[PDB]
């Protein structure tokens, strides 16, 4: 189970957020959480942390920070598989430039990919090759 997927820009500003349960019901609480996460994280190719009582697996590209968040009890490799599948699906779709400019140019790609990976918090698919194939079929 995934509780959230976030992509923040280099200023910590939300490019994409999806929350799958009621942990952060208001937008003010979500944005505060996003700010806290951002301020407690840094550039990396892949890190796991407990933050805010939750398991956060995350990674950065040149100007984007990608987080996949689960409960404090979750299998953290499952959460990493989501994060890799999302990132690697984008890498294929963005011709290997995973950056704010390219991603904003194909946000539907992004939205459809996340919907192939997670459905209401349930992890449906961790192979990015599968995901990109299905996004191509849907838009």
Cα(91)–Cα(79) distance, integer angstroms: 18
Task: Print the domain residue range for 7.
Answer: 1-139
Closest CA relative to residue 41, chosen from 52, 49, 33: 49
Cα(116)–Cα(134) distance, integer angstroms: 7
Here the CATH number for the domain that contains residue 130 is 3.30.450.60
Helix (H) or strand (E) holding 90: helix 76-93
Resolution, angstroms, 1 dp = 1.6
How many domains is the chain partitioned into structurally? 1
- Within 10 angstroms of residue 50's Cβ, the number of other Cβ atoms is 10
């Amino acid at each position: 189970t995934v509780k959230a997927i976030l992509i923040l820009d280099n200023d910590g500003d939300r490019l994409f957020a999806k929350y799958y349960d009621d942990t952060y019901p208001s937008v003010k609480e979500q944005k505060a959480f996003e700010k806290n996460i951002f301020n407690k994280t840094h550039r990396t190719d892949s890190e796991i942390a407990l933050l805010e009582g939750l398991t956060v697996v995350y990674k950065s590209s040149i100007d984007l920070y990608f987080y996949v968040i689960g409960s404090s009890y979750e299998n953290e490799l499952m959460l990493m598989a989501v994060l890799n599948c999302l990132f690697d699906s984008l890498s294929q779709m963005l011709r290997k430039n995973v950056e704010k400019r390219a991603l904003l140019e194909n946000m539907e790609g992004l939205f459809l990919a996340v919907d192939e990976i997670v459905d209401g918090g349930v992890i449906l698919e961790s192979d990015p090759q599968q995901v990109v194939h299905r996004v191509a079929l849907r838009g």
